[PDB]
Design a protein around this ligand. Structure first.
Ligand SMILES: [Mg+2]
Ligand SMILES: [Mg+2]
Ligand SMILES: [Mg+2]
Ligand SMILES: [Mg+2]
Ligand SMILES: [Mg+2]
Ligand SMILES: [Mg+2]
Ligand SMILES: [Mg+2]
Ligand SMILES: [Mg+2]
Lengths: 131, 58, 262, 141, 185
RNA sequence: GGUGACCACGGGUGACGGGGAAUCAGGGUUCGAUUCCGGAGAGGGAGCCUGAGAAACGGCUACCACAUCCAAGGAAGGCAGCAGGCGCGCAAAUUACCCACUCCCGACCCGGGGAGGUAGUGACGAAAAAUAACAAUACAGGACUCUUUCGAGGCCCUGUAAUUGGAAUGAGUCCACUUUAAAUCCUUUAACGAGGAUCCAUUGGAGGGCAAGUCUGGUGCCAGCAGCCGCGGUAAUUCCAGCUCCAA
């Protein structure tokens, strides 16, 4: 906390997607890679923005520590944040749930439904037995 | 065929077995080059010999 | 193949798109439209590679769906719509508009324009003919056609078109001494003044152009887009004023600019 | 002498490709007879089954028994002779062994004092002969 | 299909003839002089001068007043005088043909830290760099063959994290210190 | 009538064509199955439906060849797609994860994509780069230096063996962060983690070509080495070994 400077560059706000895009280079001198939570709250404090709408991703640490470059998307509203974001970024913060099945069983389910034609009970009951 | 193949592997078997001795581990890489560079270059020989080779078995 | 293709490879993409070999196997593959695939920017690589508005392809899809990207007066929801030469790309939310003009190196350069400038747009008539009922039609270098044109427009000429009406505000006759622009070949993206046109019956005509700096060059007639009434262009020119400088003097241009800013 | 006309290029190219059939290197690789007669079929190595163990007299200045094996390659069924190049690596060979024979090193030509032998065995019973010689790994018992 | 690049080149060329007593002694003199690990990296600097001197020779055979000769010739002059292998006033193509490989080999990071007093021995310099102790400007470098330019020559220093500049003592010193303080107070 | 010694026609091709690759004075000589473009083909032929576009084959019909289940009355096939097997061989990867990127399709911001990406095997190949450095003692050596051999140290450089001997680090264990669709690897970063630092560098050679032994012991034209000259029949500069050197 004694020396954690957060600088940003290439900043631009696009009202197209209702967000301000910027690339941020953190500088921890002798500490480890700073977690995304600490970046999120400090960046929110710099922009006077609420610390639940800021998004940061893709942090690459330079050789030997120190400079670490990431990309930050800040939004004017959380509703817009849910409106236009990749689902994995929303899932990281917990706003979106992706508790699904694996793709293989989904493909087995779909090809099982090909055999059964039209029946409103068995075209959907085709996977009830092979769960 | 004449069949003198019964003598195959005769001298190799006849050789008296002597075990390899225990020596210091040889240096590798840059240390190996450092050792041999210092071996043959940074030294002044007053003794004659017409620059005899590195494996002079005298 | 048994039919038309619908995939374009990244390596097979046009050179002026300035695409990179590593991010993806494929290329935008612009849909069919007013312009050919070799001289058009799909909207995906105008909002993701030029202005960096989108980071990946799904954001430029989302912003096209939000219906702010208005091309040439009409909204376009197609992610790979061919923009083409000197078409207005208006984003009303930012209040800024764009004109797609080749730079001095023959590449579609970002060129912002004023709102009053985007109310009009030039075009090059390609074929003149008369349809049924004695109604003269007039197709242009776009896919557009207009009925009842002024009889004093011939082929390979220029017409000024004001948007939302599709009417000919004025016309430029392709003639000696009128400022033009190269639209293909080696000299693509150069601004000069016509000096001579030689005609070859049954073959491509060749024009000779001398720019402001006295440098002379030549190109085929199909690569000519007259834009200026004699010497004053009817459209705001891109940065660099459309003069091709040799490899020698951009080196000292970068050296002096770096020294001046350093 | 040779023709030097401005339009004698057809004669020059026809004479050159007619005369290229007179050096052994071009003729061997282009006629196709050498390719079909090659026991390896154009391969660097081959696999065969040992039929017999034979000894070959050395050339006149030398005097020894050179240990070789008669090998019938599994593909194209051609019988060859394969030298066994070590002090006691013939004893590693038994009858009916999958041996990986290779050329000797001068393009299907006899080497040294061994007459009429153009191949040497490299592996036997799916294990390297050199590994057996150095004792690195044992026979597959 | 794939989006890979596979654009690669060889950085060294093996000598045409092997086993020459004159040539092997010449290379072994260089290896001892500059602490090189193997002859591959005295071949790569030989190849670097081989391509540089070849390009200069090709440019000099070009016709005078050729824009290609002027632009390309001054282009490689700029990077040659940047890395310091050529004098600032010696901005000519002809004097490039007289360049050697010794003045290239002294542009290495290992030779530069040894020649600047940061290391007492040339072989000590390589082990110091490879152990993440040296730095250039503010970026830590661990490549002995890291070339240096004039604008970076005066910025060579120990890294902040190494036990030669700032703090952060090594683990043998820490274990020895905790040995002393545990056995006596 | 038409084509032909300006090579028709016929035959072969271990021939898909090109952009290109290897070698590099100039000229040239080979290789391009292979990710880009064009063509062709879906076990071999042939014929069609639909459709803008197919003579389509992850469409159909028939024959030929292989092959599947059967209650023997019938029915169903096309991995030169991704994986994975058999076989063929000298010769080549996992019956993995995901549409997050690039793009495509669709009525479509919402679905799908073994295209594709990600990971696994991976010494085809290419780039960088560990296996150690320093100091103090010995015994040497230096233009060494001080008287002009003699003795030493006001200095410099390797080597052999030592409580040296305390400074420095990874290779690994492994906390966390990071990366990522989710992981993995890389980069940071705790804490352990080197004195035969046994945390062990190998592959080929030592007659010449061609760098390096006329060292020692066995063998005795035998066994073997040896690309070529050649070594070997009781004193082997060449075999088989030990030791020592050389090349990378
Ligand atoms: Mg074929
Ligand atoms: Mg091809
Ligand atoms: Mg193809
Ligand atoms: Mg077909
Ligand atoms: Mg249709
Ligand atoms: Mg078919
Ligand atoms: Mg090791
Ligand atoms: Mg020996």
């Amino acid at each position: 906390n004694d020396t954690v400077t957060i600088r940003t560059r290439k900043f631009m706000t696009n009202r197209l997607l209702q967000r301000k895009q910027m690339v941020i280079d953190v500088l921890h001198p002798g500490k480890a890679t700073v977690p995304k939570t600490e970046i999120r709250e400090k960046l929110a404090k710099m922009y006077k923005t609420t610390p639940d709408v800021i998004f940061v991703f893709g942090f690459r640490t330079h050789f030997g520590g120190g400079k670490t470059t990431g990309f930050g998307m800040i939004y004017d509203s959380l509703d817009y944040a849910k409106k236009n974001e990749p689902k994995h970024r929303l899932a990281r913060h917990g706003l979106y749930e992706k508790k699904k099945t694996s793709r293989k069983q989904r493909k087995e389910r779909k090809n099982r439904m090909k055999k059964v034609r039209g029946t409103a009970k068995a075209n959907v009951g085709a996977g009830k037995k092979p769960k | 065929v004449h069949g003198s193949l019964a003598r195959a592997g005769k001298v190799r078997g006849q050789t008296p077995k002597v075990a390899k001795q225990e020596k210091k581990k040889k240096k590798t890489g840059r240390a190996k080059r450092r050792m041999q560079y210092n071996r043959r270059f940074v030294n002044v020989v007053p003794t004659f010999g017409k620059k005899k080779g590195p494996n002079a078995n005298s | 193949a048994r039919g038309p293709k619908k995939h374009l490879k990244r390596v097979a993409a046009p050179k002026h798109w300035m695409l990179d070999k590593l991010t993806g196997v494929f290329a935008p593959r612009p849909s069919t439209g007013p312009h050919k695939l070799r001289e058009c920017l799909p909207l995906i690589i105008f909002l993701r590679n030029r202005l960096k508005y989108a980071l990946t392809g799904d954001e430029v899809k989302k912003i096209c769906m939000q219906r702010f990207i208005k091309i040439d007066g009409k909204v376009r929801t197609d992610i790979t719509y061919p923009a083409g030469f000197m078409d207005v790309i208006s984003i009303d939310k930012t209040g800024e508009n764009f004109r797609l003009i080749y730079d001095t190196k023959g590449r579609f350069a970002v060129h912002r324009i004023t709102p009053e400038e985007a109310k009009y747009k030039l075009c090059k008539v390609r074929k003149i003919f008369v349809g049924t009922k004695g109604i003269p039609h007039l197709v242009t270098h776009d896919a557009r056609t207009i009925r009842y044109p002024d009889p004093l427009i011939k082929v390979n000429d220029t017409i000024q078109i004001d948007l939302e009406t599709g009417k000919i505000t004025d016309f430029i006759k392709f003639d000696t001494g009128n400022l033009c622009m190269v639209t293909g070949g080696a000299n693509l993206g150069r601004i000069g003044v016509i000096t001579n046109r030689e005609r070859h019956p049954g073959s491509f005509d060749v024009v000779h152009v001398k720019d402001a700096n006295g440098n002379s060059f030549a190109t085929r007639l199909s690569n000519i887009f007259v834009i200026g009434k004699g010497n004053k262009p009817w459209i705001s020119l891109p940065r660099g004023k459309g003069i091709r400088l040799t490899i020698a003097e951009e080196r000292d241009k970068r050296l002096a600019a770096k020294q001046s800013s350093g | 002498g040779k023709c030097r006309g401005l339009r004698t290029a057809r004669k020059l190219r026809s004479h050159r490709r007619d005369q290229k059939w007179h050096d052994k290197q071009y003729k061997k690789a282009h006629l196709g007879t050498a390719l079909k007669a090659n026991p390896f079929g154009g391969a660097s190595h081959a696999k065969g089954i040992v039929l017999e163990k034979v000894g070959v007299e050395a050339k006149q200045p030398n005097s020894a028994i050179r240990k070789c094996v008669r090998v019938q390659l599994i593909k194209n069924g051609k019988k060859i002779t394969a030298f066994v190049p070590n002090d006691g690596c013939l004893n590693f060979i038994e009858e009916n062994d999958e041996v990986l024979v290779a050329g000797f090193g001068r393009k299907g030509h006899a080497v040294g004092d061994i007459p009429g032998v153009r191949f040497k065995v490299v592996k036997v019973a799916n294990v390297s002969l050199l590994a057996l010689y150095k004792g690195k790994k044992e026979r597959p018992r | 299909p794939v989006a890979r690049s596979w654009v690669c080149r060889k950085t060294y060329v093996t000598p045409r003839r092997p086993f020459e007593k004159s040539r092997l002694d010449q290379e072994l003199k260089l290896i001892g002089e500059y602490g090189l690990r193997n002859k591959r990296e005295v071949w790569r600097v030989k190849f670097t001068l081989a391509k540089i001197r070849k390009a200069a020779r090709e440019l000099l055979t070009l016709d005078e007043k050729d824009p290609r000769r002027l632009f390309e010739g001054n282009a490689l002059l700029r990077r040659l005088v940047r890395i310091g292998v050529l004098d600032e006033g010696k901005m000519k193509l002809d004097y490039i043909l007289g360049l050697k490989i010794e003045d290239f080999l002294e542009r290495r990071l290992q030779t530069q830290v040894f020649k600047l007093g940061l290391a007492k021995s040339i072989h000590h310099a390589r082990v110091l760099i490879r152990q993440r102790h040296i730095r250039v400007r503010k970026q830590v470098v661990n490549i002995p063959s890291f070339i240096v330019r004039l604008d970076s020559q005066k910025h060579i220093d120990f890294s902040l994290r190494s036990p030669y500049g700032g703090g952060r003592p090594g683990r043998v010193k820490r274990k020895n210190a905790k040995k002393g303080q545990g056995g006596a107070g």
